């Protein structure tokens, strides 16, 4: 029953998100991870 969630209207400081060393793996496909903090996103969804 994997969860679906939508994320919109937020300022996402992905550097602080990266600061969580507890995340065992962190892979980015379409962009380089360092570029996260320099790009916009018109549609953001999350699965957990």
């Amino acid at each position: 029953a994997w969860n679906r969630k939508r994320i919109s209207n937020c300022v996402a400081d992905y550097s602080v998100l990266y600061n969580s060393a507890s995340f065992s793996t962190f892979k980015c496909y379409g962009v380089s991870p360092t570029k996260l903090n320099d790009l916009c996103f018109t549609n953001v969804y999350a699965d957990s």
Binding site: Y18, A21, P33, T34
Partner: protein
């Protein structure tokens, strides 16, 4: 040197990480070899 094994993946050419960000990093044009072995038997304290 001696470092934690978790961030060992960061220490490699091309690879990145917090240790690569501001602790220490080998450039992507690396000319050499990287070896490591666990030393918990003697470095424990």
């Amino acid at each position: 040197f001696v470092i934690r094994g978790d961030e060992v993946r960061q220490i490699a050419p091309g690879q990145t990480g917090k240790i690569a960000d501001y602790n220490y990093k080998l450039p992507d044009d690396f000319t050499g070899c990287v070896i490591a072995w666990n030393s918990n038997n003697l470095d424990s304290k």
